[model samples]
Target: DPAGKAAQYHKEYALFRSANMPSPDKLATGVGFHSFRIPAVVRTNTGRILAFAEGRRHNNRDYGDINLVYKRTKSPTNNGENPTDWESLREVVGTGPHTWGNPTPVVDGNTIYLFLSMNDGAYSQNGGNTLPDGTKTKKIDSTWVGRRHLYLTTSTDDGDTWTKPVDMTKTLTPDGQAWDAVGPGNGIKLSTGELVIPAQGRNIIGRGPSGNRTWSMQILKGAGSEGTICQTPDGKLMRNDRPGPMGHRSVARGTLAGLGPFATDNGLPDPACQGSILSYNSDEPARTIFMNSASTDRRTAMRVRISYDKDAAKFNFGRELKDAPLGNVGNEGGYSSMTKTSDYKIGALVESDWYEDKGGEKSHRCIIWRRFNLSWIINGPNN
Candidate 1:
């Protein structure tokens, strides 16, 4: 009955639309955003679902005034298919004139730990922030303050509120990289009880006799990572990442101590874009779920696949999200993040470009949230 029900329960819809903005009072800056992107999702220990994204102000461009924002379910529900199911959008960290984004989250017990990548808004990823009338500043540098930095925020109340972000750049940054990114995706909690937050190429670890905050250290060296991290059935931390321009997913397996010797998996074609992965279970059909835009060069044709073995090198059972049997959507894709829902469903937040912001013309980006189950994926052409 579970399998039969799963096959019949698939639904996909736009959770964050480019045209919609939250009320001013809900934002930290008391301002509305023009667009949203960089989605990261998680369901808390209390069964509450939290969906996060970047509230881009001027345009959908990665730079400029950006705020870290999120929406939460009004209550735990198996039927979050309706827009009414989610509460109004709320700001997490959006004060100041700088950028605050990249929601990488991991839930341990009742506490949800969030990691963010930040920088001065006047500077872009490749150059400094711009001025009021449009004077260009230098790109982000290695300075202690203005350079790209990492911060953390936590929530103990089932996704309702959060603490102001705390800087962790001193303890957690990768060597001397002037520019870096935290997961534009979700982080993971290992079975061994360590919290691993994936980033540009290094995984940040948080563990403690006091819980996840007492100790923080660098866990792994990585790539295409920021490349998300997931646990394999055999108990190894497998970093299945979107290896840039390689046209495939990069695979790395090791303990939480360190990771390396990444190899490309030819089976999972990618567009050098961020992808999402989840180690569903060691039992229950032995599954590891992966999702990404399945193309050599373009961000399109987002697909989800299931690997039934512990090795996790191949995903023989897969399906394109565009082909879902219910409430089907388009082939549009970009960065995506995933988490298993309380009702035995794979819930995902996927990126969609609303207007493309072509030739300096300003438009916005949106996020599409979807939920499906094993039976739907098993209905794939590969199966």
Candidate 2:
């Protein structure tokens, strides 16, 4: 069954095109994209598909220099092969003061949230009105170099307009357990109608020996139909601790209101998570979390852990996508995307090499955005 499905998944595209030509041609050329590295693609509620990327300049690490660029949809689902119908455009582009990279845009009913990171010089708030201390606060641009902070920019008018940047980095702890900011995964707006933002953590904490690479997430309390704030142990604007109840404090829910924090036992590994959240498929269900990381030999592979119980919070590495059977030799799948279809099948996209030969060291050339069945993935064995 696994072999049959994987074959069907790989061949369904032939129906959409001729034997001599490629069906899904390139629609939009990327601008200022370093490698098309980590992209976040979301099909709008309007049936319009949009793609955002970590628009790193040709070669510029000027603090907060990388901005997020986007493109429009070319086409929609036709032959159940692939969604290749898309045009192109730079909808909300930013490039200046610091780097604006990794835009993870999610639409929650009326609001559209863009979670991205600001690097180097532009990692802190530009200014502010009043602090919780009731003191008048000025715009603090005294951000550090090589420092990355997560910020939220929202749009209410359906991707047309956006709000000013709101820094969410003031909540990391002093030990430097959290540093870099990445995607806030598909948040859960629970039955109670609370918003949850799943984000990741970074290292480089304090002065001297305390600095190290790490990742984790936290729940955004007090979020409603409006929004939420980043809270720290010391009640700071942007500061959180590592090795918290959850993973490494890497990816967390930005507007966590109804749901509580998921606690783990001890430590979680790096590449903490390229997170995905979705509803269950089977009647006898399991809470599953999907992520991708480098193998011991540094190949990209997809991994999943289905919780033993509904309330269980820790990550289990039992279910994974290895290379041997999948026929990949080098970096294959990382930066994953997942969604449960109406038929109870999970469709996914992985950043992978177009050809096995083109990958080894730094030769990852293309991204393989795929749609496959979850059952095929779980039962399939390594070659």
Candidate 3:
């Protein structure tokens, strides 16, 4: 029956499309974005799916002009059987030469909260130099190198409209901290109802009611960038991060004591690529899922892992999309985000590049939307 169900899952319906493509309609001299990256997706309480990303303008570099961009499904579906019904990509927030990115969306009740990292365009990750110990040689001042801060915005009408972003930097960012970031991906609403957004080597905790909330201190110092958080069935917190040059991911466990000093998650090796993990169900024999480029040298071998123990000590089941088409850049896979759809299927927004043979240059940088079934994920092959 498991194998039969797998075949049926494959036969039913599947959809793949570029959510953010380098199309003429999406390009503009001073207004439009040239590329998109860092995807974050959330299924709203009303069942609508929201896909968020960074619309990078000018070039593919991390800095420069960037805006928070998003797409919403035209009609809510439990199974996501229709692929072509998504609304056109829209800019949620953007200002000339300023950077607003790292979308960490958490859908609570009727309101969908979006957390972003805002930076002055004068300085970028490319412009700064890091020392041997990972400290920046040049710090953020008032001039060319600008400071990074935490910002929050909300959408009461689902993903249709957003409130003007409110600055939470003063309360969230530790004093004397020059650079910081909130989750460039999705955050988790704890079993206790607290919201946790992973950031640059730390976690920003939020408490109280939805609109009126208070922020707290940074936990897990020097953890990793764009860290993803989730809760175990037992109610403990865990964070998986990408700390490069080490060839593996950093895993931290949070207890009554505090978030850990991290340790290497050897099972989840990496080339320092961003990955996503979600707790599918909190019931006994709980299910948790993870997705990433299962490689150490290049951005390829995209795989989905399943865990039943909730501790994520061992992902006994995995399936890699190794045979999928290599995009224009010849690299089929890289940055990925995953969410459980209303229909109990897995929805993923993955980074794929297109390349040409003559020049071996990248043709386009886009996010590919993929929807698959759990039967396929469990019965599928390993990475």
Candidate 4:
């Protein structure tokens, strides 16, 4: 029940039955995608279905490097009879460095979290590109933008194999020659186990000044090799940088594991607004964030801002009462995804490029489930 059409499979015992997931109206072409931006989807506790989006080779108006194309559905949206027999797309990569652009993925039980945005050199200084020898090139005039770092790749066995990148950029934050922090949201492991990640710091590529560009979270201290080691100390990093007006935000995390090992806990500071969502209420491990301030325009006219409270603590600790917004906004929701679903209810999935202004040539679409069920996002019901 990832919240869509949900089930099917009987084309002469398709492989041996049991496999459905393809009714967002029988999808057929939200799959070619390009420069479309960051669209990350997840569903793998054992159900088997992982998704990653962000494919651009140079046709969708610049920033042509953002690859992170993934697919895994040989059956889920109800099985498969009318929807391409479940699902079966691929491209999750497994080599070295230099993969540029955003492509997020998160899952905790079997372990499989991936967050990207790198650029040794491709096209970033706003547009000019070039800057990767040792780094340290900030022009600011011709726009020559270059400074985006955030890498962590992992897969326990489900997504096959992946483990070479771990330059977590000083682990998360505050170690820096700071310019851009990177991470369009997705990463959490609390209840004392530690490690809560949410990022979107800024130096420009879109927007971030606190105006809504500093929503942060990174409190890892433990966890083994998802691959690339480069010197494992054993965790102990805490960060909570805020400019929170909702400018370039993206956050989604919820876990307490019964508060077993969480040290002090931490995370709080958002205003510049973008797409800041986190959840927790009933099973009580305690945590909340359904935020979005608004400044959308990667295509349509998206604006978001939300709030909620209960947060107990994990890394350093967290705090925020309530500020809900499930009304609806278009475009630039800033790459967000959250979950708590099951009667207690809570859901969200956002990325940008909605119909890219219709034509002139800016194609890229992936709109699946703009869901809201936590009382329709804390009762802000306009409908």
Candidate 5:
């Protein structure tokens, strides 16, 4: 087994296929199985792994009847080290008409906290009618365009069960905003125990001592709706986000003064796709890891970069996960999420596309769970 050779401990697991989902009779949306987008993964305190995603019920479009689905690994020994078995695909959160998506999960103590962004199914990013004030002429509030609310839920049984989603709209949403969305991926828990969720180009931090908890929000200028955050080894926090304009990645650094203005990370090239980041080791001589389609124009060339310095200013090592002509229109490598397993290995969930036609006409979107050790990341290919 590769476990004996940490440097070669790379293993990939294919999870989630829309075709096998419950039929419309059992599931309100039915089993037409379209695509699975937006992935978020987290390791529970109990050492089990939970992978979350937006199960696009009808088609592959962003809006419409979408529900949050997840799969938890079973009997994960050595913290998911020996390639554990996974439970069947399960729908974790959703209602009938409303859209419940953007699974941003964070673990604190024995509790696994998940954040979601909800919006009315009738409204859409590309379908809404706009007024002169630049607001979508929708109902409910003339002053607002498309409406999106922030919600949170938690599981004390290591992701086996979850409480009803608690609405944080009145408390989380800022005044006079046209639209909002939470991380469709994962959030970071600061050293001080504060939970920071990457929202619509903004960072939402949950503060206050236990029982007296409250929340605060800060917008990251130039960052897009989908973003990820990680704490550097030196205690400085950094956010590597997708540039809304579809070019290079937007990088922001911060300390007590708060996250500074966003700037392009010269080292990280992207195509306006969601990415994932993690602080591999917090101790001295720390390591920070990042993953994305390290390409300038296409959602391909997926790679993971390693930064030895506390600040991820320059990635000294890297490994490309795929080669050229990477699957277009729902192929392998897009929208990635990463977490450090208890066995000190790197665990990642990468989106893949299976094309049914020669010209990539039709395809089924799925996820690939990969497990590797730090030895491989640091000494893989050095790309």
Candidate 6:
């Protein structure tokens, strides 16, 4: 409903109190999701909204007993306005002694496809790895214990249930590469009906013509870490990613046949954090939308930008999430995901850091479901 008459905006506390999620302060009391990070959201073909995250059991570190978790709209309308519309939190996959994260999903017809990365809980991604209990572990590498894996899971009944996750590590990951990360946002179905999931360089693809039942990978050589994909108005695959320590967005486009070159966009400042790109419209006013922590050093000042042409080489308009209505933004920024809601507004699950005066300098990590339209963003201050 981007063209709908009503200009609406609504925000709600979701992952903090999401279904099955434990208290944020579970550190003292114990037993619950100590933290929820890396959000991914998608609206199924049935218009059922599904919000996902990494349920960190003990701490906020990337590696640990992290599980892939989610919650879905109780009704098809999703009623973004109703706080109670989301059902209880549920686990799609995880026993948690290991790590299962990066919930990237794509909706094909009625089937929901999800991609994730898994690894041994004892290992860390870099050097100087020492566990909380003081045990030494290996850094992430190509070996069995250190390697991170790629996996896929599917749901057919509108996020009601998912299939057992199948590891795509051997099938998709290239040799010598140890770590891997998927969309951790959401994927898109092209106008031609092909499904694409943005990973680090490998644009995961679904079988065309026959249907998106089986999938594989097509590497976009330099696709930066933790990126997202969108289709261009010209019918090309555009990948917008965050380059490690680059402080800018790595932007580029490709085709089903193969990928092209890449470059950094200074207009889009990044804190080397994951962001999302969505192909908003293809009709008369063809448009694309992008969201990120519009800063180069800190993960703050989340913003969304819109582009009408030039293949999005430059975003023509934008507005900060802080410009949102009162009570909407509170320490909100960092990693985020977006999808067109059943009612037309953009439904986004944005990461937030809530610092409490309670004890020490403890900050509770949470997710906010912000629903808004083009009207509201355009009305906010911007260049």
Error of 5 at 138 (Å): 7.1
**Regions of candidate 6 where Cα sits further than 4 Å from its true position:** 1-8, 18-31, 130-133, 208-212, 325-330, 355-362
Candidate 3, residues 1-383, lDDT tens digits: the string is 23216542432111222223423225233355545678898888888899888877654446657788888888766434565567666777886567799898887667788999888765555456433234433344533237787788989998898988988877776666666777777887887778878887678777778655576855576588778888877688888887656477788877534786688878887788888888887655588888888777666778877877757777754777653443432356777777788876778877765433322222445677777676677777552
Off by over 4 Å in 1: 1-6, 20-30, 128-132, 209-212, 219-222, 325-331, 359-361
Q: What lDDT score belongs to each candidate, Candidate 1 first? A: 0.76, 0.40, 0.70, 0.38, 0.73, 0.77
lDDT of 1 by residue, 1-383 (tens): 14534444577777776644232214544566667789999988777789999988766767777889999888877435567788888888887877899999888887888899898777777774454558775687788665788899998887788998998888788556678789878888887788888887777777863234653655554465457888888788878777866488887888876776778888888878889998886656678888998887877678888887776767864788777522222235888988888888888999876544442436566788888887787776666
What digit string (tens of lDDT, one per residue) describes model 6 on residues 1-383? 34434554546555444223343312222446756779998888788888898877755667777788888889888645566787766888876478899999988887888999898877767745555676755788898668889998988888899999998888877777887888879888888888888887688888755224667788887788687888889888888898878489988887889878878889889999999888877787887888998889877778887887747777845778876633432367779998888676788888876544322223456688888887666565563
- Cα RMSD, model 3: 5.0
Task: Predict model 1's lDDT versus the native.
Answer: 0.76
What's the TM-score of each model vs. the native?
0.91, 0.57, 0.86, 0.27, 0.86, 0.91
Q: Candidate 5 lDDT, tens digit per residue, 1-383?
A: 12225545676656565553332112334444466778899988777899888877655656667788887888555555433377766776768655678899988777778889877766666555433245552433313435777888888888988989998877677776656778778887788778888888678887766323477777666666787888888777788888877777898889535788789887888988888998887665677888998888777578887887767898854777752223333467788889888778888888876655423323566677777776666556554
lDDT of model 5 at position 162: 90
Error of 3 at 242 (Å): 0.7
> Which candidate, 2 or 6, would have the higher lDDT against the true structure?
6
lDDT of 2 by residue, 1-383 (tens): 23224432221111111111243222144333323345565544454444555443432222223456554444433212344433443635464535676565655556656767665432333433332244433333434443456666776655555777776666531234224445433333333333334444322111111112122344343211111122222212221222222233222222222333323224234233343434442244444434444232233545543433433344455335543223332245545544443333444444544332353322323334444455444444531
Ranked by lDDT, the better of candidates 2 and 5 is 5
What is candidate 4's lDDT per residue for 1-383, written digit by digit as tens? Answer: 12112221101111111011122111133433334445454555665555555555333432433455555546433212222433544445423333454555556667666767665434344544433343433322222133456666778876656676665655453443333434454544433343344444321111122112122342333211110000011222222222333333222222222111222112333333223344444333333444332332232223222322333122121111112222222233344444443333333445443444454334443433233443333333231
Q: Report the error of model 1 at residue 14, Å.
A: 1.3
Winner by TM-score between candidate 5 and candidate 4:
5
TM-score of 6: 0.91
Better of 4 and 6 by lDDT: 6
